[PDB]
Ligand binder design. Structure first.
Ligand SMILES: CC(=O)c1ccc(C)cc1N[C@H](C(N)=O)c1c(Br)cccc1Br
Lengths: 558, 427
């Protein structure tokens, strides 16, 4: 029938008006198909014929779709969707199963003629007009108007949700503690009552909804236990995903991989192991999708590795507001991180992976901390509190990093958990100049136009060194310099650069990087006992450096 | 009940529409405090639940006005104020008394309660929209509209000015030498009396308000180990930027002088007129860093010159009422904080150093957020407007822990830096 709910007042963006889009007449065939339909649709009271006094209207279309035997009606009000006001987005969030408590029993009540029963604002009813034509240019004009939430109209999704919650309020009042969650056209009643006892309440609800006009076509609380919701396979005790089938073959395009990469991402939710590093990186160079993307042994290896993990259908558990939440982290791969937050000492609640990409030349300790926060954030949203962290990193090591970082950070309660790799600042520069140790004055330049660079150094003993460099920009050689400096120094060394960049990186305490050059600066540093990196304004007259830059530019100038 | 009065028509500054700031996920604990608070505010008629016909939003938060006390609601009217208050600041803009900074002591009285009386334009209520979030997005949130003047909207205190300028009339009459500035529901009262007397003329005024307008000001004092000054006192007069000190060891080891040329170098933009050439000569030769090289005639002359030239500033005191003062903070040491409020690059109107021994309030985020509060409160006293902050903190991390140590009623505009600051020096 029609719900006797309190309507909701809607309007068009100030300055706009009722869409004035006449309908292009289709074949007289569907013209009738429209007649037979609207007729009963009007008989139900959902519509009322009004032709003249409403100038506005929209295009009315009718065709078949998705293996059905009865005609369909496609009246998408997009133009109207453009002139209509904005509403409070029905669902600005994504509910995560992990944040749900297990119920002894649950069901789904299809509320598919949902909108059609909720009456639209007494005024707006006008702006929802559509024109019904006839055959051979003969047609007086059967203009119609909706009395309920239009099939497409922008407000429908919203108004309906706001109207349902009202519909249900009294019910859950006389009979509480029965989790009810409503996604658009799906009602999920859940509780901890025996199959029968439970269904006893469902009826109470159904008839309640029968009172408010929402006739649940489902003669009973009948629905497929393995509920498919947003890729989530749900049950009164566990959750997971399954359609994550990954096909393989020769000549896969950039589009193919991107899709495959996207797939691997979703599964990670519950399957602890998915690594999209190499595959995600191959997508680099966004431009042509149909362009066949080549995978190198590495990329191929990835697919293989993940593929089997997926083979394992790991189940996911729910949450319990009596056991303290825990978050364990493992340092995997190079720039990829994985984590699992759990309640029971062995039952995965939710799993995720932090993909390090924010910046190149990042300290691992920083990475962990980032992942920590990333986890806190995602936790807050889903559950309601911050979890205790099981962290693979020496406590005393943390104390060193935080105290000496320009940024401020915060890590809740977190205890040490010895896993495969330990988070530890590999090397570390000194604070004051080493007494005695040989001082090296590095320097490097490069004619940008010729890509010809030059590196070298000068110790406090007249030990000079210079080596030609090609296809190198000013900065790169600057590093190569400090490199040379490291190559022929001692366990204790002092280096003086002119580069702001060289100091920006090294002092960043980097460890990993897709930069062989930078990597070897780390290699040399990881070996030495004491190293002192110092910076002085270039081209301002500084001990040695002044002159250094001279022997470096011992030829072409830049 | 039926005791309202005519309202003042408020209208969005031409151009913009209602705000729609996405609400940040709040923890369960705080949501409880919010739902409670809100319910009483509905039981009291201060705010009325609203429908979907309103696509507006202003973030809400939960904070404890005092250590170990109850919860306090806090709406983020930064956005709405920008559109709505930026128009109204030229119409009802409450003038700022410079006599406030010149005086000795200053107490900040919370007068928010007052605004809870004057009803707002039944038409403007729409914009004040504020959504309380629910966990896991189970519920799309208990949306709320405001009825009276919310304690966040910069346009509210403007309206309530009417009454306030009266309530104060008497008191001011008997106490002529006490300046009473009013910024965003914060009563900034200043004077020159001996603190002993100050503590009096303040409770006096606190007892006054409570008598005539039933303006109840949350009493505050801490007799504990963390004893804070009585009435939360400030001392504008005790404020000045002098911490910049060059080492007395500038002519010892080459390394030293090297650093010296480091500081003097950058200072070139802050203090036009400084030279370094002479001093550079001393460190010009390829040498070790630990080799001691004493001062030389010309180097010495220019060191002494710059050494002092740093104490007395030059021009820069150009306060452009148009350009918004930008505040920038720099994490220095263990408990030591430093900030600079400039308008144009290197042309600062003031610099300071927040000091909160690391240990008890060890939290970096606690000290930073603490500094964020302190850096502004004064800013209010001296320029009478909130600076734009640049905090050396992770975007996500800040938003997550800032409401936890926050005890303010207003929220300074902030943005997050993600680059190693060269400003991270001895100062
Ligand atoms: C937020 C919520 O409770 C929920 C969200 C989405 C879906 C698809 C179902 C939801 N709850 C149900 C229910 N009927 O209560 C549920 C299922 Br399905 C499985 C386990 C527990 C719960 Br509470």
């Amino acid at each position: 029938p029609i719900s006797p709910i309190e309507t909701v007042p809607v309007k068009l963006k100030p300055g706009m008006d009722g869409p004035k889009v006449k309908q292009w007449p289709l074949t007289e065939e569907k013209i009738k198909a429209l007649v037979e339909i609207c007729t009963e649709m009007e008989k139900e009271g959902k519509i009322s014929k009004i032709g003249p006094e409403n100038p506005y209207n929209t295009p009315v279309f009718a065709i078949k779709k998705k293996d059905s035997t009865k005609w369909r009606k496609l009246v998408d009000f997009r133009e109207l969707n453009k002139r209509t006001q904005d509403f409070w987005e029905v669902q600005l969030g994504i509910p995560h199963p992990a944040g749900l408590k297990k119920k002894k029993s649950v069901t789904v009540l299809d509320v598919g003629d949902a909108y059609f029963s909720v009456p639209l604002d007494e005024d707006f009813r006008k702006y929802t007009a559509f024109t019904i034509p006839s055959i051979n240019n003969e047609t007086p004009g059967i203009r119609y108007q909706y009395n309920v939430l239009p099939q497409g109209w922008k407000g429908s999704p919203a108004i309906f949700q706001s109207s349902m919650t009202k519909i249900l309020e009294p019910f859950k009042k006389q009979n509480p503690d029965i989790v009810i969650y409503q996604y658009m056209d799906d009602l999920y009643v859940g509780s901890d009552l025996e199959i029968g006892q439970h269904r006893t309440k469902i009826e109470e609800l159904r008839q309640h909804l029968l009172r408010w006009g929402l006739t649940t076509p489902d003669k009973k609380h009948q629905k497929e236990p393995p509920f498919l919701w947003m890729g989530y396979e749900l049950h009164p005790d566990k959750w997971t995903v399954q359609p994550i089938v990954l096909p393989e073959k020769d000549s896969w395009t950039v589009n193919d991989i991107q899709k495959l990469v996207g797939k691997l991402n979703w599964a990670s939710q519950i399957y602890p192991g998915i690594k999209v590093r190499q595959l995600s990186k191959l997508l680099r160079g966004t431009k042509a999708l149909t362009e066949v993307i080549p995978l190198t042994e590495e990329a191929e290896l990835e697919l293989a590795e993940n593929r089997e993990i997926l083979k394992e259908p790991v189940h996911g558990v729910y949450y319990d507001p009596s056991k303290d939440l825990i978050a364990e982290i493992q340092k995997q791969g190079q720039g990829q991180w994985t984590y699992q937050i759990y309640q029971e000492p062995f039952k995965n609640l939710k799993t995720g992976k932090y993909a390090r990409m924010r910046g190149a030349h990042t300290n691992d300790v920083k990475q962990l901390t980032e992942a920590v926060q990333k986890i806190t954030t995602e936790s807050i949203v889903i559950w309601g509190k911050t979890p205790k962290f099981k962290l693979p990193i020496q406590k005393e090591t943390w104390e060193t990093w935080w105290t000496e970082y320009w940024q401020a950070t915060w890590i809740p309660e977190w205890e040490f958990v010895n896993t495969p790799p330990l988070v530890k600042l590999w090397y570390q520069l000194e604070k004051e100049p080493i007494v005695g140790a040989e001082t090296f004055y590095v320097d490097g330049a490069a004619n940008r136009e010729t890509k010809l660079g030059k590196a070298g150094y000068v110790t406090n003993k007249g030990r000079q060194k210079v080596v030609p460099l090609t296809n190198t920009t000013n900065q790169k050689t600057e590093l190569q310099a400090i490199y040379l400096a490291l190559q022929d120094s001692g366990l204790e060394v002092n280096i003086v650069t002119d580069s702001q960049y060289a100091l920006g990186i090294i002092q960043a305490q980097p460890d990993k990087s897709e930069s062989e050059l930078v990597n070897q600066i780390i290699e040399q540093l990881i070996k030495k006992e004491k190293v002192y990196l110092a910076w002085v304004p270039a081209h301002k007259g500084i001990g040695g450096n002044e002159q250094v830059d001279k022997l470096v530019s011992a030829g072409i100038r830049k | 009940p039926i005791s309202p009065i005519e309202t003042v028509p408020v209208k969005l500054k031409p151009g913009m529409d209602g705000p729609k700031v996405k609400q940040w996920p709040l923890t369960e604990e705080k949501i409880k405090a919010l739902v409670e608070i809100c319910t009483e505010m509905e039981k009291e008629g201060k705010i009325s639940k609203i429908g979907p016909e309103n696509p507006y939003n202003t973030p809400v938060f939960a904070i404890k006005k005092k250590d170990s006390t109850k919860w306090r609601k806090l709406v983020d009217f930064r956005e709405l104020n920008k559109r709505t208050q930026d128009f109204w600041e030229v119409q009802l803009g409450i003038p700022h008394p410079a006599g406030l900074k010149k005086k000795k002591s200053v107490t900040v009285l919370d007068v928010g309660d007052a605004y809870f009386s004057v009803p707002l334009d039944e038409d403007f209520r729409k914009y004040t929209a504020f959504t309380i979030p629910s966990i896991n997005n189970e519920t799309p949130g208990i949306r709320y509209q405001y009825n009276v003047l919310p304690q966040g909207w910069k346009g509210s205190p403007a309206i309530f000015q009417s009454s306030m300028t009266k309530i104060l009339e008497p008191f001011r009459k008997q106490n002529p030498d006490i300046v009473i500035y009013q910024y965003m529901d914060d009563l900034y009262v200043g004077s020159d009396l001996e603190i002993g007397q100050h503590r009096t003329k303040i409770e006096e005024l606190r007892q006054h308000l409570l008598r005539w307008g039933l303006t109840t000001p949350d009493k505050k004092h801490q007799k504990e180990p963390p004893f804070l000054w009585m009435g939360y006192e400030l001392h504008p007069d005790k404020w000045t930027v002098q911490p910049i000190v060059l080492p007395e060891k500038d002519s010892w080891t080459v390394n030293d002088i090297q650093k010296l040329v480091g500081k003097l170098n950058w200072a070139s933009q802050i203090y036009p007129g400084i030279k370094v050439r002479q001093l550079s000569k001393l460190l010009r030769g390829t040498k070790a860093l630990t080799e001691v090289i004493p001062l030389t005639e010309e180097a010495e002359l220019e060191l002494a010159e710059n050494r002092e030239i740093l104490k007395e500033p030059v021009h820069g005191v150009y306060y452009d009422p148009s350009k918004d003062l930008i505040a920038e903070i720099q994490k220095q040491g263990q408990g030591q904080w430093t900030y600079q409020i400039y308008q144009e690059p290197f042309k600062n109107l003031k610099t300071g150093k927040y000091a909160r021994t690391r240990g008890a309030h060890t939290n970096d985020v606690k000290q930073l957020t603490e500094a964020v509060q302190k850096i502004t409160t004064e800013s209010i006293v001296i320029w009478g407007k909130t600076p734009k902050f640049k905090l050396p903190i992770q975007k996500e991390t800040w938003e997550t822990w800032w409401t936890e140590y926050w005890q303010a009623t207003w929220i300074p505009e902030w943005e997050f830096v993600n680059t190693p600051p060269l400003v991270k020096l001895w100062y």
